Amino acid sequence: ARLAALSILVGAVGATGPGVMITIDDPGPGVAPEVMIDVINELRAAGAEAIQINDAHRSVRVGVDTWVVGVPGSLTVDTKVLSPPYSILAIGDPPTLAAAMNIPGGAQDGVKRVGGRMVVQQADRVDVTALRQPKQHQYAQPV
Amino acid sequence: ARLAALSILVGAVGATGPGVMITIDDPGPGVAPEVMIDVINELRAAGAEAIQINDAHRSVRVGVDTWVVGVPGSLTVDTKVLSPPYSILAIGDPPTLAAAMNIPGGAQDGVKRVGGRMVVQQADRVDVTALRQPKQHQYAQPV
Numbered sequence: 001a002r003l004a005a006l007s008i009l010v011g012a013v014g015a016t017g018p019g020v021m022i023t024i025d026d027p028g029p030g031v032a033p034e035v036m037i038d039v040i041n042e043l044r045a046a047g048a049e050a051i052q053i054n055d056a057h058r059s060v061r062v063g064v065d066t067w068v069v070g071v072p073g074s075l076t077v078d079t080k081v082l083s084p085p086y087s088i089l090a091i092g093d094p095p096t097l098a099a100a101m102n103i104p105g106g107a108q109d110g111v112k113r114v115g116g117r118m119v120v121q122q123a124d125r126v127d128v129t130a131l132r133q134p135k136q137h138q139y140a141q142p143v
Numbered sequence: 144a145r146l147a148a149l150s151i152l153v154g155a156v157g158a159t160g161p162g163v164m165i166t167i168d169d170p171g172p173g174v175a176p177e178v179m180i181d182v183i184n185e186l187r188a189a190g191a192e193a194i195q196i197n198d199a200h201r202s203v204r205v206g207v208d209t210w211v212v213g214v215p216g217s218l219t220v221d222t223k224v225l226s227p228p229y230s231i232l233a234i235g236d237p238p239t240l241a242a243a244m245n246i247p248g249g250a251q252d253g254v255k256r257v258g259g260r261m262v263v264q265q266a267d268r269v270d271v272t273a274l275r276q277p278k279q280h281q282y283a284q285p286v
Binding site: 005007015019127128141 | 147148149150151152153154155156157158159160161162190192193206207208234235236270271272275276277278279280281282283284285286
């Protein structure tokens with residue numbers, strides 16, 4: 001049971017629970033990586049225990065060391081080049097996560113100020129199925 | 144087979160394999176949190192598969208969300224307060240891990256500039272026995 005918690009944190013197993021599904025429409029496009037990073041960081045600060053970012057074609061499991069780089073219209077998230085609209089699935093307390101997205105002056109203003117829109121849906125069940133890139137150990141062995 | 148690999152990845156169990164032992168003597172003391180974070184990231188760069196940070200009395204198993212705060216002489220790593228000298232154990236290709244330590248402009252140069260010393264010992268076997276202690280998830284459950 002310690003293994004489950006550690007495995008969810010590292011993104012090595014899928015997770016399910018209550019949470020939110022956030023859609024970001026970015027017609028400009030204008031949402032730069034810094035804005036996406038702020039959104040992710042605010043969700044984590046608000047208690048999200050698993051986060052996945054999707055576009056129409058790809059899904060990425062977010063970890064604490066995830067890279068989000070690129071330009072509006074083309075955000076590279078742990079190597080996957082995503083284009084809008086984006087979907088963010090986050091497991092946590094749904095009204096807490098929604099409130100975090102509605103803080104005056106908060107992360108969502110980065111989306112709004114570039115002509116984007118954010119819809120935050122609260123859900124009884126959100127499935128974070130994407131896994132972080134697995135790699136086999138070449139040197140470490142069990143004791 | 145897969146359970147052991149996962150368990151090592153997430154820091155649920157100990158690991159053994161070739162690697163390095165890094166000793167940092169800090170007589171000032173002058174080694175700040177930033178330098179220890181650089182040590183960890185250099186070792187990760189070089190392909191470290193398990194990392195443990197020791198002082199004379201305590202041990203911390205490094206993981207993806209490991210943080211370091213504090214001041215020279217008293218570094219808090221994942222809630223454990225450590226004081227020099229420090230010992231860092233890392234499992235990986237010993238020549239690659241050693242090479243990382245010798246790259247100019249990083250952690251070793253930071254140690255040197257504050258009057259400290261680093262010793263890097265390559266070893267055919269290093270044991271990482273400290274385990275990570277996960278926080279209880281309130282919302283996410285495994286699938």
